[PDB]
Ligand binder design. Structure first.
Ligand SMILES: CCCCCCCCCCCCCCCCCC(=O)OC[C@H](CO[C@@H]1O[C@H](CO[C@H]2O[C@H](CO)[C@H](O)[C@H](O)[C@H]2O)[C@H](O)[C@H](O)[C@H]1O)OC(=O)CCCCCCCCCCCCCCCCC
Ligand SMILES: CCCCCCCCCCCCCCCCCC(=O)OC[C@H](CO[C@@H]1O[C@H](CO[C@H]2O[C@H](CO)[C@H](O)[C@H](O)[C@H]2O)[C@H](O)[C@H](O)[C@H]1O)OC(=O)CCCCCCCCCCCCCCCCC
Ligand code: CL7
Ligand code: CL7
Ligand SMILES: CC(=O)O[C@H]1CC(C)(C)C(=C=C/C(C)=C/C=C/C=C/C=C(C)/C=C2C=C(/C=C/[C@@]34O[C@]3(C)C[C@@H](O)CC4(C)C)C(=O)O/2)[C@](C)(O)C1
Ligand SMILES: CC(=O)O[C@H]1CC(C)(C)C(=C=C/C(C)=C/C=C/C=C/C=C(C)/C=C2C=C(/C=C/[C@@]34O[C@]3(C)C[C@@H](O)CC4(C)C)C(=O)O/2)[C@](C)(O)C1
Ligand SMILES: CC(=O)O[C@H]1CC(C)(C)C(=C=C/C(C)=C/C=C/C=C/C=C(C)/C=C2C=C(/C=C/[C@@]34O[C@]3(C)C[C@@H](O)CC4(C)C)C(=O)O/2)[C@](C)(O)C1
Ligand SMILES: CC(=O)O[C@H]1CC(C)(C)C(=C=C/C(C)=C/C=C/C=C/C=C(C)/C=C2C=C(/C=C/[C@@]34O[C@]3(C)C[C@@H](O)CC4(C)C)C(=O)O/2)[C@](C)(O)C1
Ligand SMILES: CC(=O)O[C@H]1CC(C)(C)C(=C=C/C(C)=C/C=C/C=C/C=C(C)/C=C2C=C(/C=C/[C@@]34O[C@]3(C)C[C@@H](O)CC4(C)C)C(=O)O/2)[C@](C)(O)C1
Ligand SMILES: CC(=O)O[C@H]1CC(C)(C)C(=C=C/C(C)=C/C=C/C=C/C=C(C)/C=C2C=C(/C=C/[C@@]34O[C@]3(C)C[C@@H](O)CC4(C)C)C(=O)O/2)[C@](C)(O)C1
Ligand SMILES: CC(=O)O[C@H]1CC(C)(C)C(=C=C/C(C)=C/C=C/C=C/C=C(C)/C=C2C=C(/C=C/[C@@]34O[C@]3(C)C[C@@H](O)CC4(C)C)C(=O)O/2)[C@](C)(O)C1
Ligand SMILES: CC(=O)O[C@H]1CC(C)(C)C(=C=C/C(C)=C/C=C/C=C/C=C(C)/C=C2C=C(/C=C/[C@@]34O[C@]3(C)C[C@@H](O)CC4(C)C)C(=O)O/2)[C@](C)(O)C1
Ligand SMILES: [Cl-]
Ligand SMILES: [Cl-]
Ligand SMILES: [Cl-]
Ligand SMILES: [Cl-]
Ligand SMILES: [Cl-]
Ligand SMILES: [Cl-]
Ligand code: NA
Ligand code: NA
Ligand code: NA
Ligand code: NA
Lengths: 151, 151
């Protein structure tokens, strides 16, 4: 057990209503988030590959295993995993993020932002309960503060 | 040095002409290979996640690093990496494949086949020199025999 695990449980209280509202079977998530821009996108994927190579390999393995278990508990019409497996996934991903230098995490976020159309966040929020999305985001801000303190 | 490395060099002789002919900047590769089928596709990604969790973590790390180096040597109008980095990537991926039970590799191939339209291979081959694609595939068959002997 660890502090990220405890934090993931609070994050799940704040964000699982939102995860139940996303239609994870929507084909939109295959599309580029805006205009396809292969050279910029490759720049972003390069930042994620650098980060994956820096991350703790045991924690990457645990995060993959958490996703395989989460796929097993998908139910209902939106393809949402169980509450427990949602928390499991979030904690495992928090641990990975805490295992790499903060610059490498920020380089991913900045490089993905560069290819994401400014309309995309509002479009996604429009598909769910806006108050539940805001609740989930405030959850995330609290969770990443625990992540940074392990990092 | 190892036998997969030696095998990757022979594979590169057989397949680098083909890699130079693919337009790696074509946006088609973002599309589903046929009809979008999220539940079947999730089944396939589950097989790949199970395989990623089983793979040797040091060899996964080395394979990520090889891709970051390959991104750095992309040149020309098709986005092809250097000959050296092509071989590097292939060897590193061969090592990963050799680190997991053969059933897990076959489960990925069968699960991806299920979502791939039968026209897709011929469409992709039509974009390159067909003789060079055949040369690359015969290269692959030889390479996977060395991979299986390390597995
Ligand atoms: C064939 C190959 C296949 C490979 C495919 C790879 C896929 C690549 C691309 C897909 C990802 C992008 C799509 C969704 C965007 C979701 C993020 C978002 O909606 O974000 C919404 C935010 C909204 O802006 C925020 O809005 C906030 C609003 O807060 C205010 O209001 C709040 C409301 O509750 C709170 O009260 C809060 O306290 C208060 O201050 C603040 O102003 C913040 O400063 C501001 O950042 O936009 C921002 O962050 C702007 C930056 C957007 C970055 C977008 C993505 C996130 C970055 C890394 C993701 C990792 C990699 C993704 C790839 C796959 C992973 C494996
Ligand atoms: C937002 C989330 C983002 C996530 C996205 C994830 C992406 C997922 C899907 C994309 C991948 C599919 C697209 C391309 C298909 C390419 C494979 C192919 O063209 O294959 C062409 C072959 C042609 O058939 C073969 O054709 C051969 C022809 O050989 C003959 O002719 C030859 C000619 O030289 C030789 O002479 C040879 O000796 C002689 O026997 C034989 O008949 C073989 O038995 C027969 O299998 O088709 C076959 O294999 C049929 C099976 C097709 C399987 C397709 C893919 C390969 C499977 C695993 C790939 C790994 C995962 C991909 C995902 C990403 C990876 C990280
Ligand atoms: C272990 C390796 C791994 C696997 C096997 C895997 N992922 Mg992830 N993965 C996703 C889907 C996915 C699917 C369908 C799936 C199927 O198996 C997987 N993944 C699997 C997307 C939802 C998502 C990429 C697209 C994306 O960012 O969509 C927004 C993210 C969502 C809805 C997840 C929940 C996030 C918060 C807890 C709650 C919501 C807050 C807010 C309202 C919206 C986000 C704001 C943002 C600024 C924080 C994703 C991530 C991400 C990561 C990372 C590191 C991973 N992954 C890793 C993996 C993000 O940072 C990254 C991430 O969330 O960045 C914030
Ligand atoms: C280390 C983790 C990793 C990273 C960071 C990564 N890949 Mg891969 N990755 C690809 C692109 C890619 C890009 C653009 C890219 C950007 O950075 C990356 N990847 C990055 C696609 C070309 C490809 C998935 C789509 C796909 O299969 O397209 C066909 C494959 C090609 C052209 C690669 C060359 C293959 C042969 C040596 C030569 C050609 C023979 C024949 C004419 C056609 C294929 C026949 C097939 C039955 C063998 C891919 C693979 C694959 C794997 C695996 C394990 C990986 N990856 C792994 C990664 C396939 O098995 C898998 C694979 O090749 O299966 C055969
Ligand atoms: C081999 C293998 O298994 O790989 C695995 C690799 C990983 C990394 C482990 C993995 C993973 C995670 C991944 C990739 C996550 C990707 C998330 C992508 C989210 C994409 C989104 C939000 C895309 C869009 C596109 C939109 C388009 C919006 C608009 O165009 C629209 C409508 C109309 C315009 O007028 C205006 C517009 C509003 C602009 C939008 O609003 O959003 C996974 C899945 O496990 C597969
Ligand atoms: C060895 C191997 O196999 O590796 C494989 C391993 C994987 C995992 C499969 C793999 C992969 C994928 C990877 C690495 C994905 C990386 C995800 C990074 C996500 C980063 C995020 C979300 C970062 C941020 C930063 C943010 C900052 C927000 C704020 O600053 C803002 C704006 C304004 C401030 O006022 C407040 C603030 C709130 C501070 C935020 O909001 O989010 C890959 C590439 O395949 C390689
Ligand atoms: C088709 C289908 O059905 O798919 C099904 C597939 C599944 C898997 C079964 C499934 C599921 C679950 C999924 C997708 C869950 C996704 C969870 C994503 C979690 C992401 C996390 C936590 C990312 C981060 C990034 C962080 C960054 C933190 C920092 O940068 C920040 C901010 C500020 C810096 O100063 C300090 C910092 C610390 C560096 C962090 O702290 O955390 C579902 C829903 O059922 C759909
Ligand atoms: C070859 C093939 O077939 O592969 C298949 C493989 C899969 C895995 C099966 C597959 C899949 C599924 C995938 C990747 C699912 C990914 C889902 C990502 C969902 C992202 C969402 C919801 C994003 C947001 C962003 C939001 C932002 C909200 C706010 O910022 C806004 C506006 C303003 C403020 O208020 C604050 C805020 C509240 C922060 C929101 O509210 O939501 C797919 C697509 O089928 C293809
Ligand atoms: C977060 C992050 O960084 O994730 C990283 C995760 C990884 C795994 C590390 C990673 C990787 C590798 C990946 C995903 C490889 C994916 C390869 C996909 C290949 C897709 C192909 C061939 C798609 C098509 C679609 C076609 C459509 C064809 C047709 O419709 C057409 C025209 C007309 C119809 O009449 C008939 C038709 C002919 C049917 C086609 O012919 O082919 C990467 C890139 O590093 C990103
Ligand atoms: C911990 C962590 O981060 O994990 C992350 C790690 C990664 C790597 C990023 C990641 C990923 C992606 C993964 C696992 C991808 C897996 C790729 C598997 C590829 C398998 C292939 C091509 C298999 C085959 C089998 C074939 C058989 C062909 C033949 O039998 C045929 C027909 C007929 C016979 O007569 C002759 C024959 C020739 C014998 C073939 O031709 O090809 C993921 C999911 O994100 C998790
Ligand atoms: C947008 C852009 O510019 O992107 C740029 C991105 C890069 C990275 C810089 C770049 C590049 C290079 C790339 C993509 C290289 C891709 C290489 C893929 C190699 C895949 C390999 C080896 C897969 C396998 C699968 C195997 C399976 C073997 C078996 O199952 C088989 C058969 C039969 C079983 O009985 C026994 C077995 C042993 C189990 C194997 O043995 O090997 C490029 C080109 O520049 C494009
Ligand atoms: C959000 C965002 O923007 O992400 C971006 C991220 C990236 C990485 C920048 C990105 C990218 C690039 C990607 C994934 C590139 C993937 C390329 C895959 C290429 C696959 C090819 C060539 C496949 C084949 C199959 C063939 C088959 C030929 C044969 O079987 C045939 C018919 C018959 C026999 O003769 C034998 C044979 C000879 C075997 C062939 O000949 O070729 C992209 C798309 O821009 C999106
Ligand atoms: Cl506890
Ligand atoms: Cl571009
Ligand atoms: Cl470790
Ligand atoms: Cl040697
Ligand atoms: Cl479906
Ligand atoms: Cl090891
Ligand atoms: Na460790
Ligand atoms: Na479960
Ligand atoms: Na090892
Ligand atoms: Na190089």
């Amino acid at each position: 057990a660890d502090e990220i695990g405890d934090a993931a449980k609070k994050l799940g209280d704040a964000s699982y209503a939102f995860a139940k509202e996303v239609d994870w079977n929507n084909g939109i998530f295959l599309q580029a988030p805006g205009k396809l821009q292969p050279l910029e996108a490759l720049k972003a994927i390069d930042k994620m590959i650098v980060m994956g190579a820096a991350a703790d390999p045991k924690l990457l393995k645990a995060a993959a295993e958490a996703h395989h278990k989460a796929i097993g508990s998908v139910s209902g019409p939106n393809g949402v995993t169980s509450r427990a497996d949602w928390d499991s996934v979030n904690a495992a991903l928090g641990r990975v993020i805490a295992s790499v230098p903060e610059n490498m995490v920020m380089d991913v976020y900045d490089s993905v932002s560069k290819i994401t159309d400014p309309k995309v966040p509002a479009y996604m929020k429009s598909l769910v309960n806006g108050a539940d999305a805001e609740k989930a985001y405030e959850g995330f801000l609290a969770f990443k503060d625990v992540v940074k303190k392990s990092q």
